[PDB]
Amino acid sequence: MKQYLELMQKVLDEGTQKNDRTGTGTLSIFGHQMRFNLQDGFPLVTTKRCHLRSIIHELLWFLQGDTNIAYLHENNVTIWDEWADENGDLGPVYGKQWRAWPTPDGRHIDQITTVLNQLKNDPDSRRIIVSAWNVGELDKMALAPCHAFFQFYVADGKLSCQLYQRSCDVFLGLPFNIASYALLVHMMAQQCDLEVGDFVWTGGDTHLYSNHMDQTHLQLSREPRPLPKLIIKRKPESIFDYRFEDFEIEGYDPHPGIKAPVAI
Amino acid sequence: MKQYLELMQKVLDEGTQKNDRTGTGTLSIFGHQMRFNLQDGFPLVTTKRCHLRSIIHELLWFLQGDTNIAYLHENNVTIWDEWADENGDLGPVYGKQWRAWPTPDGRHIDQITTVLNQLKNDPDSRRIIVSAWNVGELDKMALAPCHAFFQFYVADGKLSCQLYQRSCDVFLGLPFNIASYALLVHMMAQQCDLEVGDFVWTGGDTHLYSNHMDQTHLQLSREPRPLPKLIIKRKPESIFDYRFEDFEIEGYDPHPGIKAPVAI
Ligand SMILES: C[C@H]1O[C@@H](n2ccc(=O)[nH]c2=O)C[C@@H]1O
Ligand SMILES: C[C@H]1O[C@@H](n2ccc(=O)[nH]c2=O)C[C@@H]1O
Known part of the structure; x- marks a missing residue:
């Protein structure tokens, strides 16, 4: 995508040499913002082939308030293996905070039903936010939330959303x-x-690891391709009743996938 | 300031007509980002005179973890009167969340000392955040946090900071x-x-109230003035030991102040 290749370029030209946790060097910038009009097509990067089936399964897992890896394993989605313990637990990460934020007085707040309530009954609200940055539970999580906070907005029959990603x-x-x-x-x-x-x-x-430079130069060689179209085949009775099969991406013709190795 | 007058302009040309809580119309945009290099001068708007003494007193009040209006009243700072109850309490707003975030298990987390700890001992951290969006305490606050979340960043001996403001x-x-x-x-x-x-x-x-249009047109008539210089006269033994008198703004020559009325 144009906005993503423009950000890749900006990290190469402007990033400072900053290191990662006792590891790899990065080129890093702080504070960046991009906008994708979702009416123009689905924002899936076409300059490298991306596989959406783990993305869908991880999202439906977050909406169930699930913090264990079992569901993902039933579908052979293995993106969280690296963080899970011996029982498949990741601690109170995303899904638990989205669906059951624990209060000091023993309540569990479902921020996803709150947000739907507000979009339906009070759409002009400037408080339609769900947060996964629960300070009192960060020590028990496998990793602190990267996509920590997001806000919805409604104007002229259209739903927008801003995500704050700390890293x-x-x-x-x-x-x-x-x-x-x-x-x-x-x-x-x-x-x-x-x-x-x-x-x-x-x-x-916002960063690029140093051992991904050949791959970022290769991707910046490529011309973006027309953005695909997401079609949802069914309207579930609620946000918690979607299934993997309800989604189809139409017209996606990417360039070949590029591998990116990680240090250990 | 150039970046602020450019944002005023952007809300007038691009904002949609959106209403406020059972009230006033606004011209509104969603998602905006500005950058101020603090080495270039202190970002105080010069196209209208701004009074910094309530700003300083409110900040030092937040750092004490104070949620009651008494301190501000001792200094005749009256910006929070509108929200305080009969005893001067505002509920667990900003200062309480910054200095004593309550956990489910009875702890109170001091996010301001955590952040100093990280800037000194682990400055390359991508987790140097303080949050005032405590979902389980939002019903007891006088108003939900507008400046909800902020992240620090260190690169090349320089401290940067990003604030997310929901409204x-x-x-x-x-x-x-x-x-x-x-x-x-x-x-x-x-x-x-x-x-x-x-x-x-x-x-x-990010919005402009409709009954501030004459005032926004008047301010956009004005040419920005050179940015002032903040001088801190003393280095306190900690972040909690600053005093009103330690700060001076040097070289501030604004245009006259503009009044903005509010509906009730
Ligand atoms: C922890 C490293 O992986 C990155 N990371 C992790 C999770 C995620 O959703 N997105 C992301 O970009 C953050 C940092 O570069
Ligand atoms: C509640 C109204 O006042 C605004 N507001 C409130 C507090 C603050 O720190 N900044 C701000 O701009 C938000 C919204 O426009």
Whole structure:
């Protein structure tokens, strides 16, 4: 995508040499924002082939409030293996905070039903936010939330959403984070009978690992391809009743996939 | 300021007509980001005179973890009167979340000392965040946090900071929110022996009230003036030991102040 290749370029020209946790060097910038009008097509990077089936399964797993790897394993989605313990537990990460934020007085707040309530009954609200940055539970999580906070917005029958991402690997992680959230805006919108608007991505420490330079130069050689179209084949009775098979991506013709190795 | 007058202009040309809580119309945009290099001068709007003494007193009140209006009243700072109850309580708003975030298991987390710890002992961290969006305490607060979340960043001896603001009145509220946070970056930096970097402002629903149009047209007539210089006269033994008198703004020559009325 134009906006993503423009960000790759900006990290190469402007990033400072910053290191990662006792490891790999990165070229890093702080504070970046991009906008994707979801009416123009689904924001899946076409300059390298991306596989959406793990993205869909991870999103539907978050909406169930699930913190264990079992569901993902039943579908042979293995993206969280690296963080899970011996029982498949990841601690109170995303799904638990989205669906059951624990209060000091023993309540569990379902921020996803709150947000639907607000989009339907109070759409002009400037408080339509779900947060996964629960400070009192960060020590028990396998990793602190990268996509920590997001806000919905409704104007002229269109639902927009801004994601704050505290940390971002532009090569490996970001194409996956944009598709996952753009998919959530389409599901939210379908349920509130609203059209899709913008997905605004805001990042904090936005970086490229040093051992992904050959791959970032190769991808910047490629011309972007027309963006695909997401079709949802069914309208579920609620946001918690979607299935893997309900989604189809139409017209996706990417360039070949590029591998990116990681240090250990 | 150039970046602020450019945002005022963008809300007038691009904002949609959106209403406020059972009230006033607004022209509104969603998702905006501005950058202020704090080495170029202190980001206090010069196209209208702004009074910094309430800003300083409110910031030092937040750092004490104070949720009652008494301190502000002792200094005849009256900006929070509208929200306080009969005893001067505002509920668990900002200061309480910054200094004593309550956990489910009875702890109180001091996010401001955590952040100093990280800037000194682990400055390359991508997790140096303080959050005031405590979902389980939002019902007891006088108002939900507008400046909800912020992240620090260190690269090349320079401390930067990004603020996420869910809601923003561009005329009345934003010049005050930029100065308050730019002042916190200078205090943090002094305490960690780092230089100042950038203040990146990110907003969510960024708006102009309809009954501030004459005033926004008047301010856009004015040419910006050279930015002032903040001098801190003393280095306190910690971030909690600053006093009103430690700060001076040097070289501030604004245009006259403009009044902005509010509906009730
Ligand atoms: C932890 C490293 O992986 C990155 N990362 C992790 C999770 C995610 O959703 N997106 C992302 O980009 C952040 C940092 O570069
Ligand atoms: C509640 C109204 O006042 C605005 N507001 C409030 C507090 C603050 O720090 N900044 C700000 O701009 C948000 C919205 O426009």
